[PDB]
Design a protein around this ligand. Structure first.
Ligand SMILES: Cc1cn[nH]c1-c1ccncc1
Ligand SMILES: [Cl-]
Ligand SMILES: [Cl-]
Length: 163
């Protein structure tokens, strides 16, 4: 575990993380995909061997000794708000199980279902709160990755609101 387990946020490409493992915002079929998933495919293509897994689940595949945790959030274009919310919470609980099993001291994680799976809605608070519910009981250093300056500010404020 980390000496003093913490949450941090960085505004940069998750493919350049400084953590002991990465969470992919994967699609269920293990395709190269878009956004975070395409950046992960470019950096760790070997990790896409038999990475297909259902919505609400996480499947880890090693690239060398570096673990890629493929976490499949729901596409809110297809799911109801209610069922989508349940599957999004479930995907993060499966990420916490994998991070724990791997014994890593740190993990790089994107906000699941906030990109092309958001159904055109702002889901920062919804996704981040489900991340906290899952990861609060783990002792890895969690580093959340985002793209946009306004998202970095709101994620940072939410982290500080608890400390
Ligand atoms: C599209 C991309 C590539 N590397 N990281 C991202 C990213 C990460 C977090 N939030 C939005 C985008
Ligand atoms: Cl970057
Ligand atoms: Cl997404």
């Amino acid at each position: 575990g980390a000496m003093a387990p913490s949450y941090r946020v960085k505004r940069m490409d998750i493919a350049k993380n400084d953590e002991e493992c990465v969470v992919n915002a994967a699609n269920p079929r293990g395709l190269p995909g878009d956004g975070v998933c395409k950046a992960v495919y470019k950096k760790w293509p070997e990790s896409f061997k038999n990475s297909a897994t259902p919505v609400g689940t996480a499947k880890t595949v090693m690239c060398g000794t570096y673990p890629v945790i493929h976490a499949v959030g729901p596409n809110f274009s297809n799911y109801t708000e209610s069922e989508g919310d349940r599957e999004l919470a479930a995907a993060y609980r499966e990420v916490a199980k994998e991070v724990t099993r791997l014994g890593v001291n740190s993990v790089a994680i994107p906000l699941l279902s906030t990109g092309v799976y958001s159904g055109g809605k702002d889901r920062l608070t919804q996704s981040l709160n489900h991340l906290f519910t899952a990861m609060d009981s783990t002792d890895a250093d969690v580093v959340i990755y985002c793209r946009d300056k306004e998202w970095e500010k709101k994620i940072s404020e939410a982290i500080q609101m608890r400390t």
